[PDB]
Amino acid sequence: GRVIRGQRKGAGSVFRAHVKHRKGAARLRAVDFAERHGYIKGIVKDIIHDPGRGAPLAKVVFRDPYRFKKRTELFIAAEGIHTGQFVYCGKKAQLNIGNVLPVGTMPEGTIVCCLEEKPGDRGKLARASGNYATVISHNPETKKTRVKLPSGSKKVISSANRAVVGVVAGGGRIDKPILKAGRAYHKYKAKRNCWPRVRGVAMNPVEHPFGGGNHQHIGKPSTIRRDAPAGRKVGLIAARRTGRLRGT
RNA sequence: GGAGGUGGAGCACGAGCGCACGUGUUAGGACCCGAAAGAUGGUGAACUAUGCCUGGGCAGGGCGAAGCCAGAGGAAACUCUGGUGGAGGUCCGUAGCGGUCCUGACGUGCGAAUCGGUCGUCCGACCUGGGUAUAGGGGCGAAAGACUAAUCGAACCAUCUAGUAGCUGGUUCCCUCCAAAGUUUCCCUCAGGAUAGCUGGCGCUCUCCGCAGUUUUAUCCGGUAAAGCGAAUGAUUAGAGG
RNA sequence: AGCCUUGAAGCCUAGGGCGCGGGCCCGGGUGGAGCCGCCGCAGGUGCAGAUCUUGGUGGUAGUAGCAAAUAUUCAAACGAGAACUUUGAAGGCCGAAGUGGAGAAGGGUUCCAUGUGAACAGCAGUUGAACAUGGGUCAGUCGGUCCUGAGAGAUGGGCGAGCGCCGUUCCGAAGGGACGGGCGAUGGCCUCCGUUGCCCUCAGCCGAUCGAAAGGGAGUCGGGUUCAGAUCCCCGAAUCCG
RNA sequence: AGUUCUCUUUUCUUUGUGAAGGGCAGGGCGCCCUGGAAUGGGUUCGCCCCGAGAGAGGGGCCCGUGCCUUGGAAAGCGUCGCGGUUCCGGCGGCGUCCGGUGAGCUCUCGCUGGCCCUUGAAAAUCCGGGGGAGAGGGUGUAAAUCUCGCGCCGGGCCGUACCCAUAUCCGCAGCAGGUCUCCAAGGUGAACAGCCUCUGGCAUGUUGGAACAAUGUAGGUAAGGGAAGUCGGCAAGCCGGAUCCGUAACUUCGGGAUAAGGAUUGGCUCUAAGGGCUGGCAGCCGACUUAGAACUGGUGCGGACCAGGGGAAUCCGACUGUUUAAUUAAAACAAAGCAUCGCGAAGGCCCGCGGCGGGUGUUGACGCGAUGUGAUUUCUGCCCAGUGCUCUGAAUGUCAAAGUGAAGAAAUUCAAUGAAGCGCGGGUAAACGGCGGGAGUAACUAUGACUCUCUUAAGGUAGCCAAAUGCCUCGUCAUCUAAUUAGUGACGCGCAUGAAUGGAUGAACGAGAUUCCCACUGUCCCUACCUACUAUCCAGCGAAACCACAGCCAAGGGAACGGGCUUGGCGGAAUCAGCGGGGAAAGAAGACCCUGUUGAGCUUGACUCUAGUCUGGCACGGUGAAGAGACGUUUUUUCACUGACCCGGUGAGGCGGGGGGGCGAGCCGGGCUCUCGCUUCUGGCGCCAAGCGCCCGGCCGGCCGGGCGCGACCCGCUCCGGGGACAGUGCCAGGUGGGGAGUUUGACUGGGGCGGUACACCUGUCAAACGGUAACGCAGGUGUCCUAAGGCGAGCUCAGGGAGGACAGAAACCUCCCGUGGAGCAGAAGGGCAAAAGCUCGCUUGAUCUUGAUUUUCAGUACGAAUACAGACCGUGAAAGCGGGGCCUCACGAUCCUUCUGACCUUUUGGGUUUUAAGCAGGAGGUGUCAGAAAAGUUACCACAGGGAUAACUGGCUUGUGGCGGCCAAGCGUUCAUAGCGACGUCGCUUUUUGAUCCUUCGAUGUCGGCUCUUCCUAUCAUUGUGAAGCAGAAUUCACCAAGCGUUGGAUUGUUCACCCACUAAUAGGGAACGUGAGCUGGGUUUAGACCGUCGUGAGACAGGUUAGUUUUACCCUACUGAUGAUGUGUUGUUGCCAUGGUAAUCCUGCUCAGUACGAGAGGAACCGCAGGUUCAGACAUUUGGUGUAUGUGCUUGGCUGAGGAG
Ligand SMILES: [Mg+2]
Ligand SMILES: [Mg+2]
Ligand SMILES: [Mg+2]
Ligand SMILES: [Mg+2]
Ligand SMILES: [Mg+2]
Ligand SMILES: [Mg+2]
Ligand SMILES: [Mg+2]
Ligand SMILES: [Mg+2]
Ligand SMILES: [Mg+2]
Ligand SMILES: [Mg+2]
Ligand SMILES: [Mg+2]
Ligand SMILES: [Mg+2]
Ligand SMILES: [Mg+2]
Ligand SMILES: [Mg+2]
Ligand SMILES: [Mg+2]
Ligand SMILES: [Mg+2]
Ligand SMILES: [Mg+2]
Ligand SMILES: [Mg+2]
Ligand SMILES: [Mg+2]
Ligand SMILES: [Mg+2]
Ligand SMILES: [Mg+2]
Ligand SMILES: [Mg+2]
Ligand SMILES: [Mg+2]
Ligand SMILES: [Mg+2]
Ligand SMILES: [Mg+2]
Ligand SMILES: [Mg+2]
Ligand SMILES: [Mg+2]
Ligand SMILES: [Mg+2]
Ligand SMILES: [Mg+2]
Ligand SMILES: [Mg+2]
Ligand SMILES: [Mg+2]
Ligand SMILES: [Mg+2]
Ligand SMILES: [Mg+2]
Ligand SMILES: [Mg+2]
Ligand SMILES: [Mg+2]
Ligand SMILES: [Mg+2]
Ligand SMILES: [Mg+2]
Ligand SMILES: [Mg+2]
Ligand SMILES: [Mg+2]
Ligand SMILES: [Mg+2]
Ligand SMILES: [Mg+2]
Ligand SMILES: [Mg+2]
Ligand SMILES: [Mg+2]
Ligand SMILES: [Mg+2]
Ligand SMILES: [Mg+2]
Ligand SMILES: [Mg+2]
Ligand SMILES: [Mg+2]
Ligand SMILES: [Mg+2]
Ligand SMILES: [Mg+2]
Ligand SMILES: [Mg+2]
Ligand SMILES: [Mg+2]
Ligand SMILES: [Mg+2]
Ligand SMILES: [Mg+2]
Ligand SMILES: [Mg+2]
Ligand SMILES: [Mg+2]
Ligand SMILES: [Mg+2]
Ligand SMILES: [Mg+2]
Ligand SMILES: [Mg+2]
Ligand SMILES: [Mg+2]
Ligand SMILES: [Mg+2]
Ligand SMILES: [Mg+2]
Ligand SMILES: [Mg+2]
Ligand SMILES: [Mg+2]
Ligand SMILES: [Mg+2]
Ligand SMILES: [Mg+2]
Ligand SMILES: [Mg+2]
Ligand SMILES: [Mg+2]
Ligand SMILES: [Mg+2]
Ligand SMILES: [Mg+2]
Ligand SMILES: [Mg+2]
Ligand SMILES: [Mg+2]
Ligand SMILES: [Mg+2]
Ligand SMILES: [Mg+2]
Ligand SMILES: [Mg+2]
Ligand SMILES: [Mg+2]
Ligand SMILES: [Mg+2]
Ligand SMILES: [Mg+2]
Ligand SMILES: [Mg+2]
Ligand SMILES: [Mg+2]
Ligand SMILES: [Mg+2]
Ligand SMILES: [Mg+2]
Ligand SMILES: [Mg+2]
Ligand SMILES: [Mg+2]
Ligand SMILES: [Mg+2]
Ligand SMILES: [Mg+2]
Ligand SMILES: [Mg+2]
Ligand SMILES: [Mg+2]
Ligand SMILES: [Mg+2]
Ligand SMILES: [Mg+2]
Ligand SMILES: [Mg+2]
Ligand SMILES: [Mg+2]
Ligand SMILES: [Mg+2]
Ligand SMILES: [Mg+2]
Ligand SMILES: [Mg+2]
Ligand SMILES: [Mg+2]
């Protein structure tokens, strides 16, 4: 057989991300003395559409505490922030939508977005439009916090991780039917070469495990073990169950 | 050390070595020509496939979404009527792009895919130039095993390589003499080999008793043809007397 | 002590013969320089075939054919020669999505003048994009040149038997610059200023480089002019940059 | 300048001003000031705007490509007129003028809106602003400075022609192909449509002349009919623009929709309405439109061009979109929607030989990655047994290396321990998939709600169906027709329907499949005519395919279909136009089929591996506390540490500790518990130090200028965080591993496959009286069994029968008699056997050890089996003897390797001892394909070498079967065998059935059916002439001579076949390579795409359905059709003969005979005559019809010649 499409996606080539018109990587501020010990002020200059991303991005301007300069940051825009608003980042910022605070200082039940996976990484969790994490509890002895992620998993993270108060803007996006293949053509023309998707059973056995046959059938179970070699790991990968999810 | 059996490619008064010529068998390109393949290293995205960058392009009509204006009705909710408006992977249809049927033309063509009428679509998942990216068990594929320079169910180039072929084709002067086999056994043996038989050549040991695809005379051997079933085995018809 | 310019090989021949045959001898002609008998040696040594190789030639056969896109005619000229060339006049066609006028890619002299009519232009030609002999492309302002794009690609580093490969800010002492100030040295319109060396002071760019004759990118227009060049030459009037 | 016969103050051409600067229109402003607005107002085609300031006034700015002006009239152009060397930017006159209009077209500038789960580059480069470090002069000879106006100098290098495409480029070429752009006139018209014209261009596309035959290619037209044609309406035809009217089912309310169906349309002359400017009015200007009316023509008018046929349904797919470049455009693919699955980053998925490598990722679960289904609507049932996937694990079977323990001289052996994985247990079907059988039963019959029973993991639920899925099958009923293998609607024990392997539906849509209806027609009945280009003939020019030699037939035989050969018929130069019978014509070493110890693509439960991946050990690999062990050391568990190692951030910018200061608490002002480090209202600003303290320099306490410190705490060893002795990496070991690699996937065989085993053996037969002897010949057996069923000895005698004896009988046991084996001897059969070879006892291990010879198969090899001996040991018997397996004929296995037994055995390499190892001899472990490879599929995506050794056509032999025909005569026929039939039997013929066979063809003979066309057979349906009937007539039946002439139109089906409708004299049957594809067609079959069912894990398969799928060449020879001609008659002509060859007419209706013969009646003929018709043939055009480019004559659309007229 030949190399299957899933195998070919890894080599880059025609499967690389379309990043020509993107505005930059969205991140928090790099952690420095002001955020470690106090707060720093910023002003929301603009809120912009980012090609390929559902959530809007906010362009925030800070003062440089060591040089006569203005620093432009590119944040995930929490819902409800507006241009000309002041946002504040640091240990002693106040609990307001759009401010950046360590999760250790936030009371239980706070709703946050663009949360750091590790202290200082500048925001990695709950960045998709409409999403957010929640604060469950703190352990000041171990200096750690328990948060609930948009997938529903609960994670233990360092209390020093920063986050933005509120939920990401642009929520409810998936509630609209696309209605058109052409509208899905445009959705992914901004993202990457992944659309449309041809089915495994619709190919020949040379390019897919499910291909071939005088009937379009899988022929073999579609739940494939976790350790199957690349080019065989297709279908339901390491599925714990299958069928209709009935119940809780 | 003896006697008596038995295994040896031995001894029993050498015959070898060297050189040359022929014939045969074989290892080598191996009598000559012939695969589908496999391997190594390289050249191609000027066609085409797909992503990206930067440019160009797409008459005239039909239908008439939301929004809005006015008049009418109504207790309210709101309803009705006439206009305005100009949406759409919307419709007819040009350029363009494509290529349904005639199973039309042509079929040593104009053409290694073209031509005519008729047809699909024609603001979009649209058409297109150049730039750039992906290279051969690799790419790329809205998926036909499609496309990847007239090459694709694995490109092209050189080499390995005069690849192997129990298989097809061919195999070049004269006269003279002799002259077959298609059968036995073994073989992943059944289009092939080895093996015995059948042939030829070289002789040599004798001769001018031996032998014989023959009969004769003796002497054995045999269970077929025929015959038999009022003889065994098997099969089978009719009466008769007890 | 072979043959041969008093004629070798080769070739041709309704000439005379020999041999069962393979073949050979002699005669005549052409030819123009070498060749053969016998004893031995050696072999890339004998063709009718292989859809054999290469070259040549037939019949087919003066045959298929020279039928896509409406169309030609009259007179004159040159000339050996005219259905096809030139001029004039008619009749037609393309019918501004052109059979018009200009470019890009590609070609590379095909462009222009004169000459030829051998070959080629599937009839002909007095004609041609053929052949021959000579010419023709002029820029601060139109492009390239510069920028970066998708991307490509060195160094540091890493990997690698190795040619090398990965990688493009990532494991890097990555600045050879500057207003100014202070110490000197040299010169000149020697008055005092330049230049120049060192020290002090100041200093993010953070990625060499390549990448578009359609993207970004200052500034040229009118008239005339040649066989062929012109927003380039000449005339006139301007303008950007330094 | 054109026209002017007539008219036309006419028609045509032409009638400029660059850049840059200045000015002014015009356009735009989300710009300013006054002011304060509801009775809200302003305002656009739409919008939209306002107390966050509308209207109204007055300003400002930006673009001004428009106009004026300098440029600049000097130039250019038009026209007229003069000169020259006359190849002069030659010189002169005049002119280059005044207005209108527009949803017009093209370009551009601007305003305003809509669309996006799409938001639509970067950089070089240039500019403005904020700040104020600095500099400049001291009132002048002014300075620093100036983005102002002039002036001065320079701008190097490379490209530049021309073509730019029915002849400059790529397709071998001047190739009907391909190849990116810019400008873009008048008329008609909605129009960049088509048609005509101007500017510009061209010469008909690599030649001309003359004809006007066939057959073509491309256009047309056809009376009457109207799909009867054909697989199928293929093709053509109909409709078509616009206005006015009108418009159904169904529907997702958007559509359907140009539904369907009507009417109108020309020309001319008018009427009305629809506006602008200046000053309810007046005047002056204007742009095309709409509506209405009269008149008018031979009812013609969207007059050319342009330009939808329609309706009722069924299947499939929602749609738009895409696709096999070059045979498949589709129902296939995609799609939105739906549902699953993995993953929280040291991660999921993937790349990569390699790493601190790479893609997703400029990403973060509303995400990325992997699958299935396929819009909406409605629903999606049961099954976790199987196969997968997944989850739990010291509780725990197996389990590698390493490590631990014991034995030993050690090698080594043994033991304990026990990672993953497997086993074990849960979950899971929108994972792959799956979802029964029998019997009885309701008061007629039928069904059978109901019951019993076997049964699996469920036993097919809702639905749906002869569906693209049902074999039987052309299912049954109904509808559609005259007639229907078609369609539709129902039915449903459904070979083999069914629920995201999605079931059912349903609007809109479709170059998708199918049926019917209206309309239309040359598809047809049934063909004809016309036009153009060919073909044709000529001048010029000029190939190629192909070719053993060739080219007339019948039969024969022959490699079974001859051009050649045999026997006959016969044969006459050279040619032209056609033609498609033959040359089993050409084209390509057959793709089908088989064989090959030839492949390749693909699959998997094949064999052997392998990347990756999971898992354990060793190393890098450290520090310290505890817990549990073992004897101060050492193993292990937990908890920590950091310094290796890893990760993240940053321009490595304030880290740890202490000091200093502020608010609180609290003990008797001080000490501490302990916390804090100066920014949160506003879409400002924020650096390059102020201040203070202390030193220093230069000049005259005063000026000028420097340095340090505090401001800005001190000390520190990793920049700051996060991990961390683990990730990870290196090397080993176990598991997984069609993701990938290589390879295999027997043979025989009346083709192969399936089936068998005739593959190694044995008995009887074949087998033809020695032996041998074949077939997928016939009847059978074999892979064992036996401590005795081996060996010896003795003693007995068996099967069966007769007759007797308590229970006792057909059969128990006892007795006598007969008994040649009719029993038994393990088994298949054949042979053999009676004081034995059988049965029963006693004793035994000759079934032991050993060398040779021989026999059988045979090559005179091996094995196996067997035969005589010889040497030992033995058994048995009194002994002779007999016995080294079974009474005989079968019962079995090389080399290499392993294992055992044997010797005071040999070797173990410099010697010696000892373990080990190797030798030598004999057994065993096994190859059954049995003289002995280690081995699964599929290919319709397929390949090569061959094969007529071998299948799929024809032909050939045969003729079982099929068909047809006799003979006998029991019967039938009321009677009566034979008018007509005919059993039980039996003899033939035929090659239009199917077989059987494999002779020809696999370097190819085109595979069904139809169409068309000719010919032949007779086994006769009709017709002519006849014979016989159970022949009264009529009708019918049987038979004879007999193939002259006929044997038809249709519905369903691809059909051959079949069936039905209808007409008819009749509706006979057949051959010609199952006649006929260089004759067609291509419906079926039979490539590649795709769907369904059944089957398969799968790739894939299916004499099962379904849909779409390239049909090549003639100019050669012959034959045939026509056309010139040839011989020789001296030449030449006219008129003739006819040898030979062809050959043709056919059948039916009416009237009359005649309501007659005949007959009870009912019914009901015939000959002769008369009048017509059918089929066929040969002509013909007076008539009717068709054609019509006489391009004949009217009419007419658009354009063109100024108009008329003529065109
Ligand atoms: Mg595979
Ligand atoms: Mg496919
Ligand atoms: Mg020999
Ligand atoms: Mg060779
Ligand atoms: Mg040899
Ligand atoms: Mg190989
Ligand atoms: Mg390209
Ligand atoms: Mg459309
Ligand atoms: Mg359309
Ligand atoms: Mg065709
Ligand atoms: Mg042709
Ligand atoms: Mg690759
Ligand atoms: Mg396929
Ligand atoms: Mg070769
Ligand atoms: Mg062979
Ligand atoms: Mg063998
Ligand atoms: Mg052979
Ligand atoms: Mg016998
Ligand atoms: Mg006999
Ligand atoms: Mg001669
Ligand atoms: Mg010479
Ligand atoms: Mg030689
Ligand atoms: Mg030769
Ligand atoms: Mg030769
Ligand atoms: Mg000719
Ligand atoms: Mg042109
Ligand atoms: Mg030109
Ligand atoms: Mg010529
Ligand atoms: Mg020229
Ligand atoms: Mg590189
Ligand atoms: Mg550059
Ligand atoms: Mg450029
Ligand atoms: Mg106002
Ligand atoms: Mg003038
Ligand atoms: Mg300032
Ligand atoms: Mg030029
Ligand atoms: Mg012409
Ligand atoms: Mg011409
Ligand atoms: Mg041409
Ligand atoms: Mg031509
Ligand atoms: Mg007609
Ligand atoms: Mg008619
Ligand atoms: Mg019909
Ligand atoms: Mg018919
Ligand atoms: Mg049609
Ligand atoms: Mg309709
Ligand atoms: Mg579709
Ligand atoms: Mg595509
Ligand atoms: Mg195709
Ligand atoms: Mg097609
Ligand atoms: Mg699924
Ligand atoms: Mg299960
Ligand atoms: Mg059911
Ligand atoms: Mg029909
Ligand atoms: Mg039905
Ligand atoms: Mg289900
Ligand atoms: Mg199914
Ligand atoms: Mg000619
Ligand atoms: Mg022949
Ligand atoms: Mg002869
Ligand atoms: Mg023929
Ligand atoms: Mg042929
Ligand atoms: Mg062959
Ligand atoms: Mg072949
Ligand atoms: Mg073989
Ligand atoms: Mg293979
Ligand atoms: Mg291959
Ligand atoms: Mg296996
Ligand atoms: Mg595998
Ligand atoms: Mg494999
Ligand atoms: Mg075989
Ligand atoms: Mg005999
Ligand atoms: Mg005895
Ligand atoms: Mg003995
Ligand atoms: Mg015995
Ligand atoms: Mg061996
Ligand atoms: Mg297939
Ligand atoms: Mg098949
Ligand atoms: Mg046959
Ligand atoms: Mg018969
Ligand atoms: Mg009787
Ligand atoms: Mg044969
Ligand atoms: Mg035979
Ligand atoms: Mg042949
Ligand atoms: Mg033929
Ligand atoms: Mg007869
Ligand atoms: Mg036939
Ligand atoms: Mg034929
Ligand atoms: Mg054909
Ligand atoms: Mg077909
Ligand atoms: Mg097919
Ligand atoms: Mg299945
Ligand atoms: Mg007439
Ligand atoms: Mg007429
Ligand atoms: Mg007129």
Curated annotation (Swiss-Prot):
Report the PTM annotation: Hydroxylated on His-215 by RIOX1. The modification is impaired by hypoxia.
Q: Which residues carry this modification: (3S)-3-hydroxyhistidine?
A: H215
Question: Which residue ranges are recorded for the region named Disordered?
Answer: 206-231
Subcellular location field: Cytoplasm
GO cellular component entries: cytosolic large ribosomal subunit
Keyword list, A-Z: Cytoplasm, Hydroxylation, Isopeptide bond, Ribonucleoprotein, Ribosomal protein, RNA-binding, rRNA-binding, Ubl conjugation
Q: Does this UniProt record's set of keywords contain Glycoprotein? A: no
A single GO BP: cytoplasmic translation
> Pfam families in the record, alphabetically?
Ribosomal_L2, Ribosomal_L2_C
Cross-linked residues for Glycyl lysine isopeptide (Lys-Gly) (interchain with G-Cter in SUMO2) are: K41, K148, K233
Q: Name one GO molecular function term.
A: rRNA binding
Self-association or partners: how does it assemble? Component of the large ribosomal subunit. Interacts with CRY1.
In which family does this protein belong, per the annotation? Belongs to the universal ribosomal protein uL2 family.
Q: What does this protein do?
A: Component of the large ribosomal subunit. The ribosome is a large ribonucleoprotein complex responsible for the synthesis of proteins in the cell.
Which HAMAP family does the UniProt entry name for this protein?
Ribosomal_uL2_A
**Protein name (Swiss-Prot/TrEMBL):** Large ribosomal subunit protein uL2
Organism encoding this protein: Oryctolagus cuniculus (Rabbit)
